[PDB]
Every structure is written in structure tokens, then in C-alpha cells.
Ligand binder design. Structure first.
Ligand SMILES: CCCCCCCC/C=C\CCCCCCCC(=O)O[C@H](COC(=O)CCCCCCCCCCCCCCC)COP(=O)(O)OCCN
Ligand SMILES: CCCCCCCC/C=C\CCCCCCCC(=O)O[C@H](COC(=O)CCCCCCCCCCCCCCC)COP(=O)(O)OCCN
Ligand SMILES: CC(C)CCC[C@@H](C)[C@H]1CC[C@H]2[C@@H]3CC=C4C[C@@H](OC(=O)CCC(=O)O)CC[C@]4(C)[C@H]3CC[C@]12C
Ligand SMILES: CC(C)CCC[C@@H](C)[C@H]1CC[C@H]2[C@@H]3CC=C4C[C@@H](OC(=O)CCC(=O)O)CC[C@]4(C)[C@H]3CC[C@]12C
Ligand SMILES: CC(C)CCC[C@@H](C)[C@H]1CC[C@H]2[C@@H]3CC=C4C[C@@H](OC(=O)CCC(=O)O)CC[C@]4(C)[C@H]3CC[C@]12C
Ligand SMILES: CCC1(c2ccccc2)C(=O)NCNC1=O
Lengths: 417, 304
């Protein structure tokens, strides 16, 4: 095992000092990375120096501690954001909002720094591979728009506040990326992401049925109604909530034409109903029979069938992404985003080098491993039942012919004697 | 039972039983409640509330009693096992619920002092939406409009607020995720895990039967209410056998071992793989012998 670990990572002068892990990643060979040896090596790197001035340094520059510090900074920023949104804001921002804005601005600067680390188009193409980093940029742009709008006169400030309120949701949901590190959680997130296509295919049909029912209900009643714009809302509004247990029992089949004295009041004569008002309830049944009991159970069955395959694929993919996570957090500076401005002002390993004797030793070990592999492969092949049967049949055929030749020859001898 | 100088080892062994820890904790809470209940009025109701909260543990403790039944015990074990997956679901549901509640609270009530009600308001309404309550009254209130109503003078409502039409839309997406996406995933997880958990639970219960039986064999006859007399008085599994019976048992064991080895060898030698291997080897040897005779037979032709 130790020699395997050493072989997996060592500079190759012939191949541009690229270790086996880098080549496997470039080839996207998930099986190689998912192997136990590579996973153990990645875990060893994750713990950095601890693996359980110099005393401080080993703890400080380990990737795991940097990950924890970044996570804590993010959590604090999130807490401040919540406090800001809930409480009233004056004309000028408070200290908390200044801190939040500075954090966002520095994070955007750090994203630009990652972009730049004349090939810029290739760098952008590579960067687009990370889907999270696109939504992050979009959310930052929306936040900047909200900030610009919030500092104007009264008519715009509330719009800026609403922009903040809508934007907070993305940052609240971004915690899935942080959770990704956990063994159990990451695959769960991947499966959740995968199921959304089936969810959308269900949604289309549900939307069709809901539109039909809403249009029918709206048309049956309110005969003399001007177009306006409320009709489009009314179509979608009521039926959508019926999926979740609200049936509006008050206004299913109103009494309409009847005498309703009620109590503590004079008798009131209600309108004499309308033509074809008894068809709405019946329809309201069929819709509920379809949206609730038919499609949802089908979706459940689809999930059950897809679960196993999605689980396996997600596990392998997360084991593959571990390496990118580890290297990304190894490269990053120690100070969390709020204070990385100093690191950027200052701005303004994976592989271990080995001695010649060790290189020759590793080469010898590799050749020995190859020889053992081929010998074992041949031994397994020659012990297969099919090969043994084939050899037995061929040798039996040859023996039969030789036996016949001897028998015919033995016949000649009888005459000789 | 703890006492039946090794006391640390006894405690370490005792901690293995998870029920016996919660039992002690509940007893301590009950003692605290009893002490509080006998003071003046301001504390007596707090003691009563302590009793009311404590009763739940004793009501749920009946699962241990049910454990003896063949069917029930495995069910309890499976229920206990599924809670990890339940927790993993709960974390994500909590994240989504917090996001929705904070958004709803922030969109409305712009001029609101911090106080402490906000933390409640965030969690309160969204949690119940999972179970069929949508608060139809206060989804999209009419706000800015004329509402004469009846048996009353005309009342002019506030002119709504900016961005109040975004809350309903959000309220849809949340419901589309919490209710139809995560729950069905949890159902699928349960379906996949059921078989393995069932088998493991059956085996584990069959293992725990012995501990149950011995524990209740050792205990005194009188139930706990009257065990004080037994303790004041305080203040089998194996049968002994004769020598001849011991020798007989040893002979039977040796015979069983001999039969086991003989049957194992008989099964091994009748395998198809071994027969094919022997056939091939003997055929090869026969072929060589046939060739040797044939070459030798050629010599004889010259001899004749
Ligand atoms: C309402 C909430 C809606 C959606 C939240 C669910 C998040 C889905 C999680 C998807 C995770 C995922 O694996 O896809 C990732 C995409 O993540 C996303 O979907 C983020 C989009 C969330 C937008 C939410 C906007 C909220 C505002 C309204 C990319 O995967 P990768 O890391 O590039 O590599 C994976 C290799 N196949
Ligand atoms: C709300 C109700 C919450 C939980 C009730 C569900 C009870 C789960 C049953 C767990 C049974 C179980 O097997 O775990 C047992 C643990 O039992 C428990 O979880 C008891 C904890 C219940 C606390 C309830 C507190 C209620 C007050 C609020 C230990 O197993 P074992 O006998 O030591 O050996 C088993 C070998 N693996
Ligand atoms: C996972 C993260 C997002 C934590 C949850 C976010 C918010 C729900 C929490 C985080 C810190 C909390 C605050 C901590 C301190 C205070 C001040 C405190 O108000 C008072 O001091 C006045 C007391 C009174 O008059 O009653 C209570 C509310 C508030 C804003 C709390 C309300 C809810 C906050 C913003
Ligand atoms: C899919 C299956 C299982 C449905 C089971 C229940 C339905 C058959 C019930 C539920 C609600 C009922 C409706 C509730 C109210 C009315 C108004 C009622 O109108 C009248 O009879 C008076 C006017 C007239 O037609 O003369 C006609 C039946 C209808 C549609 C009822 C017919 C049967 C419905 C659709
Ligand atoms: C996930 C899919 C299947 C959702 C299906 C139904 C939704 C599209 C419906 C349900 C409730 C509807 C909302 C109910 C009320 C309103 C207020 C309405 O506000 C206005 O148009 C007046 C002010 C203005 O914007 O000019 C805008 C649409 C909205 C969010 C409706 C738009 C469509 C919604 C989200
Ligand atoms: C850009 C990624 C991240 C991050 C991601 C996972 C864990 C910790 C931090 C962030 O999104 N916000 C704070 N700084 C960061 O680099």
C-alpha cells in the first residue's frame, strides 16, 4: 500500500512533471479516483500535516482549517444579513450593512482573481464548468443593483429593500455546496438535483390539467365580466392550492337561490343561482381524482425506480469531486473573504520530489507488479472450465485417431504372425 | 443492578443499555419536579408542568415492554434505525423553511422593531404548511381596495405595499419542494433500506432474547412497588452432568466431527470442477503413454 501511495504521486520528468492523479483527472477516469488507495491518499492530504512557529504553521496552512474558517465567516455574514433584513433600515446603512457589502465586494474580487489565477477565453470556458460560480455572480450582480437602488430617495429605497429580501434566498440555499463535503449529504444533493427533470415532466401535465379546470370554473360563473387582467390570476390561483389540502369548502356549491334569514338580521333573498352551476362541483371531483392520486403516485414510482442508479452514480461522482475540492481549498489563502483584501494587496505541494534511487526502486516495483498481474491472469485463464473442456475434447479426438491407427496396424501384425 | 474496585467497569458495561440511561434521566427530572411542587404557589404549577412533560417518556417506554413480541421488536428496531435518514431530510427541510419564512417576514412589516417575535414568526407558519394548512385567509389579502362589507360603514383599507405580489409566487415554489420532492425521496430511501434493516433487526432481536430471559430470571418475584421488602431481606442457567454423561457427550461430539469432515470431503470430491480437472490430467497422461507405446510399437515392426 505504501509503495502504491508513493507511486501514485511523484513528478514525471518525461511527462511534464504530471502525477498519475492529474492525468486521471484530465481523463475523467472516475474509477481510478474512486479506488480505495486514491481515496485514502486524498484523505491524508485533507488532514494536511496533522494526519491523526512550526506548531502554529502546520495547523494554520492545513486545508481543513481554512475550510472551517471560510465556513464560519460565511455563517456570520448570513446571520448579519438576516438581522439586517428583519430590522428597520434608516436612510443611511448601519455598520452591519457596510460589513455585508464589503464581504460581498471582496468575494467578487476573489472570484475575479480565480478567473485570472491570451487564453482568457479558454479560462472562461473552463470556469463555466462550475455551475455554482455562475449563480454566485448573478446573485452578486443583483445585490449590487439593489444596493444602487437603495441609496436613492424614498420611492426607490423600498424597492432596493425588496431586492435584498429576494436575494437572501440564494445565499440561504448556497449551504448545500458547503454540506457537499459530508459523506452522506453530498450524494443526497446530487440525487435531488437529478430528480428535477422528472419533476418538470410531471409539472407540465399538472399545469395543463390545472389550466383546464381553472378556465372551466371561471367561464361557468361570472358571465358578464370585463377582460381586465384578474382572469389570468384567477385561473391559476385556486386550483393550485387544492393539491395541498385546501378545498375552499365555503365556496364549492354556494346556496345561491334560497331564503337565508340567518340570525340577528332581516331576511335576505339571495340571487337565483345561474344556469349550469351544478357542473362545477362534479368537475371539481375529477380534477382532484387526477392531480392528487394518479400523477403523484406515478412520480413516487419513478423515484423508486431511479433511486438506485442515481445513488451509485452520485457516490462515484462525489468521490471524483473530492480531489477538486481539496486542491481548491489547498490553494486558497488562509484569511477568510472579509479580510482577503490584505492578501490581495500583498499579491499586488500536491506532488513530492523523489531521489534517483527511489525512482529506480519504484520502477522495479512497478515492473514486478506487472509481471505478477500477467502471471495471475494467465493462471486464472488456464484454470477455466471452458478451456479444460476444450483441451480434453481435442486430446480425446487425437487419441481416438491414434487408437484406430494402432488397431488397423495391429490387424496387419496378426497376418504377420 | 449497578452494584449487583471494578465499579468503573460495571458502569462502562451498564452504559451499553441505552434505555437505562433515559430511565435515570427521567427519574432525576421527576425528583426535581417533586421538590419544586411542594413549595409555595409560584413553584407548584411549575412542578405540575414538569410532571406533565415527564409523563411522555413513561408513556413511550412501552416499546421496551413490547420488544418481547416476535413481530413488534423488529418493527421498533427498524423505526430506530430510520431516524438517521429522517434527520438528514430534516436538515434540508429546515434550511428551505428558514429561507421562506425570512423572505415572507422581510417582504412585509418593513417598519418593525427587532424584539423577539421575529424568530418565532419565521418558523411558525411555514412548518404547518407541510401538513395541509395554507392559511387561505392571509395569502394575498385584498389590502388596497374598497370593502363595504355588510351591516357596517364603508372602510378604506391600506394601499397594499411594494412587492407584495412576490410572496404568493414564492409560497408556491416552497410547497412544490417540501411536499412533493423531498418526501417522496424519503419514501424511496425507506423502500431501499427496508430489507436490510429487517434482516439485521430480526437477527439482533434473536440475539437479545437471551439477555432478556436471563435478566428476568435473576430478578425477584415481587414487582417494584413491593421490592422494598426483598431488599430488606437482602440487607440455574446451566445443568450439572455426571461423569458418564460427560464421556457420552464427548463421544457424540467426536462422532459429529467425523461425520462433518466425511460429508465435507464427499461433497468436495463430487464437484464438477474437480472431476473435470482429474479427467483432463488423466487424459494428458494417457495421451503421452499412448504415444510412447506407438513409438515403441514402431520399433517392433522392424523387429518382426
Ligand atoms: C427552490 C429551490 C430550487 C432548487 C434548489 C435545489 C438545488 C439543486 C442541487 C444541485 C446540485 C448539483 O449537483 O448540480 C449543481 C447545480 O446546482 C444548482 O442547481 C444551483 C441552482 C440553484 C438556484 C436557486 C435560486 C433560488 C432563487 C429563486 C452543479 O453540479 P456540479 O457541481 O457542477 O457537478 C455535478 C456533476 N454532475
Ligand atoms: C417523539 C418520540 C421519539 C422517539 C421515539 C422512538 C423510539 C426509538 C426506538 C429505538 C429502539 C432501539 O433499538 O434503540 C434503543 C434506544 O432507544 C431509544 O431511542 C430511546 C429514546 C427515547 C427518548 C424519548 C424522549 C421523549 C421526551 C421528549 C437502544 O437499543 P438497544 O436496546 O440498546 O440495542 C439495540 C442494538 N442496536
Ligand atoms: C442560521 C442563522 C441564519 C441564525 C438565525 C438567524 C436569525 C433568526 C437570528 C440570528 C441572531 C438573532 C438575533 C440575536 C439578537 C437579537 C436582539 C434581541 O432584541 C433585543 O435585544 C431586545 C429585547 C426585547 O425588547 O424584548 C432579540 C432579537 C435579535 C435581533 C435576534 C433575532 C433573530 C436573529 C437575527
Ligand atoms: C370519482 C367518484 C368516486 C366521485 C364520487 C362522488 C361524486 C359522485 C359526488 C361528489 C360531489 C357530488 C356533486 C355535488 C353537487 C351537485 C349538484 C347537483 O345539482 C342538482 O341535482 C340540482 C339541479 C339539477 O340538476 O336538477 C347535481 C349533482 C352534483 C354535481 C353532485 C353529484 C355527485 C358528486 C360529483
Ligand atoms: C409550479 C407551477 C405549477 C405553479 C402553478 C401556479 C402558479 C403559476 C400561480 C399560483 C398562485 C399565482 C399567483 C397568485 C397572485 C399573484 C399576484 C399578481 O400580482 C399582479 O399581477 C398585480 C400587480 C402587478 O404585478 O402589476 C401576480 C401573479 C401572482 C404572483 C400569481 C402568479 C401565478 C401563481 C404563482
Ligand atoms: C466561493 C466559495 C465560498 C465557500 C465555499 C465552500 C465553503 C466555504 C466557502 C463561498 O461561497 N463563500 C465564502 N468563500 C468561498 O470561497
Amino acid at each position: 500500500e505504501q509503495l502504491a501511495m508513493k507511486l501514485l504521486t511523484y513528478e514525471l520528468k518525461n511527462w511534464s512533471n504530471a502525477t498519475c492523479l492529474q492525468l486521471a483527472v484530465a481523463a475523467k477516469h472516475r474509477d481510478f479516483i474512486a479506488h480505495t488507495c486514491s481515496q485514502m491518499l486524498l484523505t491524508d492530504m485533507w488532514m494536511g500535516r496533522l494526519r491523526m512557529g512550526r506548531k502554529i504553521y502546520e495547523f494554520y496552512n492545513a486545508p481543513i482549517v481554512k475550510f472551517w474558517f471560510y465556513t464560519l465567516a460565511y455563517i456570520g455574514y448570513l446571520m448579519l444579513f438576516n438581522y439586517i433584513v428583519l430590522v428597520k433600515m434608516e436612510r443611511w446603512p448601519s455598520t452591519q450593512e457596510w460589513i455585508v457589502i464589503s464581504y460581498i465586494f471582496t468575494l467578487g474580487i476573489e472570484k475575479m482573481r480565480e478567473i485570472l489565477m491570451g487564453k482568457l477565453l479558454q479560462k472562461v470556458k473552463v470556469w463555466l464548468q462550475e455551475y455554482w460560480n455562475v449563480t454566485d455572480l448573478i446573485a452578486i450582480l443583483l445585490f449590487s443593483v439593489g444596493m444602487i437602488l437603495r441609496l436613492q430617495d424614498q420611492p426607490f429605497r423600498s424597492d432596493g429593500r425588496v431586492i435584498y429580501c429576494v436575494n437572501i434566498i440564494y445565499w440561504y440555499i448556497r449551504l448545500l455546496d458547503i454540506f457537499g463535503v459530508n459523506k452522506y449529504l453530498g450524494p443526497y444533493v446530487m440525487m435531488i438535483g437529478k430528480m428535477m427533470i422528472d419533476m418538470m415532466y410531471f409539472v407540465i401535465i399538472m399545469l395543463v390539467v390545472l389550466m383546464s379546470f381553472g378556465v372551466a370554473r371561471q367561464a361557468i360563473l361570472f358571465p358578464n365580466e370585463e377582460p381586465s387582467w384578474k382572469l389570468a390570476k384567477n385561473i391559476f390561483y385556486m386550483p393550485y392550492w387544492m393539491i395541498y389540502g385546501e378545498v375552499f369548502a365555503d365556496q364549492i356549491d354556494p346556496p345561491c337561490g334560497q331564503n337565508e334569514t340567518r340570525e340577528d338580521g332581516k331576511t335576505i333573498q339571495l340571487p337565483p343561482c345561474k344556469t349550469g352551476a351544478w357542473i362545477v362541483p362534479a368537475i371539481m371531483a375529477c380534477y382532484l381524482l387526477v392531480a392528487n392520486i394518479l400523477l403523484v403516485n406515478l412520480l413516487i414510482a419513478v423515484f423508486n425506480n431511479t433511486f438506485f442508479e442515481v445513488k451509485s452514480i452520485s457516490n462515484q461522482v462525489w468521490k471524483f469531486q473530492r480531489y477538486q475540492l481539496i486542491m481548491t481549498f489547498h490553494e486558497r489563502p488562509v484569511l477568510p473573504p472579509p479580510l482577503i483584501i490584505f492578501s490581495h494587496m500583498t499579491m499586488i505541494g500536491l506532488k513530492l520530489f523523489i531521489t534517483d534511487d527511489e525512482l529506480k526502486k519504484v520502477h522495479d516495483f512497478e515492473e514486478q507488479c506487472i509481471e505478477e498481474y500477467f502471471r495471475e491472469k494467465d493462471d486464472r485463464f488456464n484454470s477455466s472450465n471452458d478451456e479444460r473442456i476444450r483441451v480434453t475434447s481435442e486430446r480425446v479426438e487425437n487419441m481416438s485417431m491414434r487408437l484406430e491407427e494402432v488397431n488397423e496396424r495391429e490387424h496387419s501384425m496378426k497376418a504377420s504372425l
